[PDB]
């Protein structure tokens, strides 16, 4: 409708269309088509179906707009990995569960283009703190 650009980030779910609370005005009020998004985005949300991946946008103007998809929520599959579909009130008094380092291999294998840490161990202990305060324990480790 006019010439105005810049950038705007967001966090629309994976295999799910946006009605009006995710976009509609959100970024629609900038000269950007959602229909041509409910399909473009939710297309690649297929490989990563089941989640809320994070997606940047980029405005030029007119009827122009881009987008870049990232890594989805790994809170989902974990809940599914201890039978619980809703986070813990107190992560340090009442914990959710515990896991193994193996599935931790793929974690850093998708989150790689994000993780800028040093070498392996680097990001091997980064996700620790995350896992740490959500509500889960670290299996195995030093010595033993």
């Amino acid at each position: 409708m006019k010439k105005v650009a810049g950038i705007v980030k967001l966090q629309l779910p994976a295999g799910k269309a946006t009605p009006a609370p995710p976009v509609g005005p959100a970024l629609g009020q900038y000269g950007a088509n959602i229909m041509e998004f409910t399909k473009a985005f939710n297309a690649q949300t297929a490989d990563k179906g089941d989640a809320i991946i994070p997606v940047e946008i980029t405005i030029y103007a007119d009827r122009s707009f881009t987008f870049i998809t990232k890594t989805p929520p790994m809170s989902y599959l974990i809940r599914k990995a201890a039978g619980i579909g809703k986070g813990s009130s107190t992560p340090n008094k009442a914990k959710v569960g515990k896991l193994n380092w193996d599935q931790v291999l793929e974690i850093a294998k998708t989150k790689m283009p994000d993780l800028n840490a040093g070498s392996v161990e680097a990001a091997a202990n980064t996700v620790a703190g995350t896992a740490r305060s959500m509500g889960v324990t670290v299996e195995g480790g030093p010595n033993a």
């Binding site: 009006a20 609370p21 509609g24 005005p25």
Partner: peptide, 17 residues
């Protein structure tokens, strides 16, 4: 619970496209 343009989770927001 209602408005135009102005929330994140129920459904209003604002308006255009």
């Amino acid at each position: 619970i209602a408005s135009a343009s102005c929330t994140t989770x129920i459904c209003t927001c604002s308006c255009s496209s």
